[PDB]
Design a binder for this molecule. Structure first.
Ligand SMILES: *[C@@H]1O[C@H](CO)[C@@H](O[C@@H]2O[C@H](CO)[C@@H](O)[C@H](O)[C@H]2NC(C)=O)[C@H](O)[C@H]1NC(C)=O
Ligand SMILES: *[C@@H]1O[C@H](CO)[C@@H](O[C@@H]2O[C@H](CO)[C@@H](O)[C@H](O)[C@H]2NC(C)=O)[C@H](O)[C@H]1NC(C)=O
Ligand code: A1IBO
Ligand code: NAG
Ligand code: K
Ligand code: K
Length: 499
């Protein structure tokens, strides 16, 4: 439709520039006819999800790298992909002119963009807020008569979510997560710092907190928004830490277990929102498998927990097999879901690196990692930030796939945007990961899935500098002869028919 207008800021690759009159976009999605494949290619050298087509061939007589699809080796079904409508994201989006706002939202949520189908919604304030508040700051309101949504919700987040839903053809799922409770429910009486709910699960404090989730869902439902899931707390481990700088609420895994079993599970199940799924953890992966063991081996907690939400701070190393792998082995029927990821959080690295191919590769490598370890979806953090990586009331700035420069009424689509889009655009909800076997050792990262309609999608990431010729074999269908250029990412799509 409209190509990337590239701009360099001195990092390893380019951003695509959008403004009030222009943004890069795709034509309406169509599949290549049976016997043809589509390839979307992005490269450090500047290609941005460029479409080409090739033939599927009956024969192959190379001896080089062969990737054989395993369409009958089935893994997890995919929920989807998206990002977070924080106060910071909403403020940044709405600071653009109406035309630029629309082109930003279409970039993420339209079929002429990358087809996001998940939005994570903070329950009141977090670090990516400029005001500290909860929905029930009036103290000792245990029946939550004064619970209400402030303008951050009613004027900023909710209208933007509605606009996103209008632009999407794919059903969008919302996920809610709280950072802090009202301070009068907390041992330390502050939004931040070390502190937990007062008392113990099953008591008035805990019941009030569970009821606040229902009040939140009720309030959003009054605005005609329904949630797919909630998490039991954003990063519950954070509130166990002395001096924690911003909004938090500390739970040990035992506290979370008992809160879910006694309070949050029963309260949600008793409500009109009983179909909303409950995800535990919502925290970093080295807390697994221990946290899953503590919560899910209690049958009274386990019956309320639909899944385990994981956060990915891509700046930092941690094992995958020992965390996600072991958790899936122990609890295969409890889905894993990546509810937050970000990069740029180290104080000594530039929060926003406009055009960083490396940060793009961190996004796609993380997504592939997640999908190969059974994770059913992947959710970015802030949908948009300013060039400082904000706003953020504690200056905990980070990067975002879209960076807004309001002085030019312009926004920049980072490599991260395209790396995420190589997945989000091409993996409909209900797709199933399938196997993909390499004939020889190689430097590529790849994942294969099957759409609900049986079509194939393969993503190939090359983090190496070398162009790698390869062949994809679909045993039902034939061979795709291709190349994975150095510092590229490709998505391949084709129709599958059997004979
Ligand atoms: C939005 O960005 C576009 C693309 O850069 C601007 O349009 C370009 O303007 C330059 C300078 O006149 C032309 O040489 C290009 O040919 C234009 N490109 C296209 C695709 O039209 C546009 O002026 C910007 N809009 C605003 C409101 O600033
Ligand atoms: C379970 O859900 C029902 C709502 O259907 C709750 O019943 C309401 O309780 C409030 C007081 O908390 C009353 O003022 C309403 O009149 C009740 N409504 C109905 C329709 O019965 C019930 O309290 C909930 N139980 C819990 C949370 O333990
Ligand atoms: C191209 C194919 C099909 C392929 C088959 C087997 C192995 C490989 C490896 N070169 C890389 N893998 C270990 S991986 O692709 O399985 C992988 C990549 C990732 F980004 C995160 C991860 F945990 C595993 C490639
Ligand atoms: C494919 O393979 C066999 C090799 O013997 C041959 O019969 C056939 O003509 C080849 N070429 C094509 C285009 O199918
Ligand atoms: K209030
Ligand atoms: K930083």
């Amino acid at each position: 439709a409209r190509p990337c207008i590239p701009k360099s800021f001195g990092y390893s690759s380019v951003v695509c520039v959008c403004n009030a009159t222009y943004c890069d976009s795709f034509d309406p999605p169509t599949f290549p006819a049976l016997g043809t494949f589509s390839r979307y290619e992005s490269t450090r050298s500047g290609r941005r999800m460029e479409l080409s087509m090739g033939p599927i061939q009956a024969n192959h007589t190379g001896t080089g790298l062969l990737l054989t699809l395993q369409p009958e080796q089935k893994f997890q079904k995919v929920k989807g992909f998206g990002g977070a409508m924080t106060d910071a994201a909403a403020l940044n989006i709405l600071a653009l002119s109406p035309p630029a706002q629309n082109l930003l939202l279409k970039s993420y949520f339209s079929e002429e963009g990358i087809g996001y189908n998940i939005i994570r919604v903070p329950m009141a304030s977090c670090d990516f807020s400029i005001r500290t508040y909860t929905y029930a700051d009036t103290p000792d309101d245990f029946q939550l008569h004064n619970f209400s949504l402030p303008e951050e919700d009613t004027k900023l987040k909710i209208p933007l979510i509605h606009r996103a839903l209008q632009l999407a053809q794919r059903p969008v799922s919302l996920l809610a997560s709280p950072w802090t409770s009202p301070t009068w429910l907390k041992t330390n009486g502050a939004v931040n710092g070390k502190g937990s709910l007062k008392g113990q699960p099953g008591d008035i404090y805990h019941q009030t907190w569970a009821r606040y989730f229902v009040k939140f869902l009720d309030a959003y439902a009054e605005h005609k928004l329904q949630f797919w899931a909630v998490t039991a707390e954003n990063e519950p481990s954070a509130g166990l830490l002395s001096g924690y700088p911003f909004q938090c609420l500390g739970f040990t895994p035992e506290h979370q277990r008992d809160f879910i079993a006694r309070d949050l599970g029963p309260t949600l199940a008793n409500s009109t929102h009983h179909n909303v799924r409950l995800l535990m953890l919502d925290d970093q992966r080295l807390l697994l498998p221990h946290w899953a063991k503590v919560v899910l081996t209690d049958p009274e907690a386990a019956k309320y927990v639909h899944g385990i939400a994981v956060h990915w701070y891509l700046d930092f190393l941690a094992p995958a097999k020992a965390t996600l792998g072991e958790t899936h082995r122990l609890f295969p029927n409890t889905m894993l879901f990546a509810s937050e990821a970000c990069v740029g959080s180290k104080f000594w690295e530039q929060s926003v690196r406009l055009g960083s191919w490396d940060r793009g590769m961190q996004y796609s490598h993380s997504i592939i990692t997640n999908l190969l370890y059974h994770v059913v979806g992947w959710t970015d953090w802030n949908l948009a930030l300013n060039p400082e990586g904000g706003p953020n009331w504690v200056r905990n700035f980070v990067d975002s796939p879209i960076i807004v420069d309001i002085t030019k009424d312009t926004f920049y689509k980072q490599p991260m945007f395209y790396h995420l889009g190589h997945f989000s655009k091409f993996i409909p909800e209900g797709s199933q990961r399938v196997g993909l076997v390499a004939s020889q050792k190689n430097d590529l990262d790849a994942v294969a899935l099957m759409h609900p309609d049986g079509s194939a999608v393969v993503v190939v990431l090359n983090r190496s500098s070398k162009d790698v010729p390869l062949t994809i074999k679909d045993p039902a269908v034939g061979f795709l002869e291709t190349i994975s250029p150095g510092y590229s990412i490709h998505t391949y799509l084709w129709r599958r028919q059997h004979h």
